[PDB]
């Protein structure tokens, strides 16, 4: 078929995919927000004595430090993920650099203007 028509169809597909990705991102954001709302339970502090409220706060802070520990664990895991991502990128660039070393440079800076000085 004609190249222009196929290119137009490819452009239509890419734009539709981008729109779907943005809509799915909106869905992910809303779903994550709602789930986060569900994770944190409502607090009813009305008519709470010093002992009850203080104990509840201490329990909440203990759970907070537990969350700190879990976030440290998942942080170590995500750093491992980042490290292996970097290793994969390094290996891929190594495979591509068998023929793509002179790719990164800048040429034709100022010498193309200077011609009639001599």
């Amino acid at each position: 078929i004609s190249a222009s028509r196929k290119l137009q169809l490819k452009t239509l597909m890419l734009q539709i995919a981008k729109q779907e990705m943005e809509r799915e991102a909106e869905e992910r954001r809303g779903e994550k927000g709602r789930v986060l709302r569900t994770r944190c339970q409502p607090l009813e502090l009305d008519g709470l004595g010093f002992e009850e409220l203080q104990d509840l706060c201490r329990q909440l802070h203990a759970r907070v430090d537990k969350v700190d520990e879990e976030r440290y664990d998942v942080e170590a895991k995500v750093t491992k993920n980042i490290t292996e991502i970097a290793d994969l990128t390094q290996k891929i660039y190594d495979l591509r650099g068998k023929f793509k070393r002179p790719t990164l440079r800048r040429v034709r800076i100022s010498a193309d203007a200077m011609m009639q000085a001599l």
């Binding site: 070393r101 002179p102 990164l104 440079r105 800076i109 100022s110």
Partner: protein, 371 residues
């Protein structure tokens, strides 16, 4: 700041700031004192014209190259050339710019140490680094393997590299280069009557070689054809008239590359030292080196050399391997383009020889880890 990628070479000094496509200023490296007496007073006659200025007043000068074969034989003249390059062709004081010189393989140590001592004491650069002229030419091709034949004007050297690991035991450096071809052409021109003797007329013979000579695909057939017909005789106009006609001197001058017995050298041509350099490598990387043979340097610009060399190597090599010869159109400045690319890298930014390091270990720092 930006780095200065200088490239001393031997015959043409090529320099320019890192990160561009072509050197900013390219000019012959000759320093010529006047030789006659001089009678006009107040004409403002200097004592030494360097660079491209001495290619216009060459009628009354005695040009003498300060670099013979890679090595530097006259340090005062080389210092003068560097001073000119920094101050008049680039107009950037060296106190605020790193420099990246280039050096042929297997050169004397004292040359490199004196070079770094000059750059650190006289010009007082912040940091300088010396790199082998073939690795840069491999950078410019965008490869990471391959065996590069860098036939400059001073010395022809053939450095094989695989996967970034250079093979130091397989470097074959041969001292036949463009200058010997100029001398041989000047010597065979005498067979028709044209005598060039003065050191100024060597430049005219060099121009003849550049504009007319070409490498024959098959030597004997060309010798037979030029001896019967007259379709090869190309004429050329000297700087004063009296056109000359070059016959079979056209392809006999650059043939010396493949038969160094013409100028009395014993060694084998550039077609067989490449095969020998390959065969010294390990048995498992010979296919890749066969497929990625790289040409560089000025003297490899002869019309028709990328076919003669491929034919010769295909004759020598096993019949199954594929022989491919990479001959980019920007051959002459390949080393400098590679130098610019290398100086523009972020990973390389900590390999410079910083001045405080030189102050602590002396000029012998160059042979150390900072190579």
């Amino acid at each position: 700041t930006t780095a200065l990628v200088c490239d001393n070479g031997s015959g043409l000094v090529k320099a320019g700031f890192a990160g561009d496509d072509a050197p900013r200023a390219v000019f012959p490296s000759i320093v010529g004192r006047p030789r006659h007496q001089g009678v006009m007073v107040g004409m403002g006659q200097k004592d030494s014209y360097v660079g491209d200025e001495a290619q216009s007043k060459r009628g009354i000068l005695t040009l003498k190259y300060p670099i013979e074969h890679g090595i530097i034989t006259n340090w005062d003249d080389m210092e003068k050339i560097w001073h000119h390059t920094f101050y008049n062709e680039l107009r950037v004081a060296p106190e605020e710019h790193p420099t990246l010189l280039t050096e042929a393989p297997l050169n004397p140590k004292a040359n490199r140490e004196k070079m770094t001592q000059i750059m650190f004491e006289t010009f007082n650069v912040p940091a300088m680094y010396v790199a082998i002229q073939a690795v840069l030419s491999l950078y410019a091709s965008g490869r990471t393997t391959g065996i590069v034949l860098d036939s400059g004007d001073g010395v022809t050297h053939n450095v094989p590299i695989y996967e970034g690991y250079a093979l130091p035991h397989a470097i074959m450096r041969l001292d036949l280069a463009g200058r010997d071809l100029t001398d041989y052409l000047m010597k065979i021109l005498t067979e028709r009557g044209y005598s060039f003797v003065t050191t100024a007329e060597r430049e005219i013979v060099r121009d003849i070689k550049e504009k007319l000579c070409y490498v024959a695909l098959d030597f004997e057939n060309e010798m037979a054809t030029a001896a019967s017909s007259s379709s090869l005789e190309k004429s050329y106009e000297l700087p004063d008239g009296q056109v000359i006609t070059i016959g079979n001197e056209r392809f006999r001058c650059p043939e010396t590359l493949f038969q160094p017995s013409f100028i009395g050298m014993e060694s084998a041509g550039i077609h067989e030292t490449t095969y020998n350099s390959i065969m010294k490598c390990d048995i498992d990387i010979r296919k890749d080196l066969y497929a990625n043979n790289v040409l560089s340097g000025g003297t490899t610009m002869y019309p028709g050399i990328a076919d003669r060399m491929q034919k010769e190597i295909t004759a020598l090599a096993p019949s199954t391997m594929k022989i491919k010869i990479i001959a980019p159109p920007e051959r002459k400045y390949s080393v400098w383009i590679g130098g610019s690319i290398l100086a523009s890298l972020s990973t390389f930014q900590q390999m410079w020889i910083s001045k405080q390091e030189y102050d602590e270990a002396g000029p012998s720092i160059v042979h150390r880890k900072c190579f």
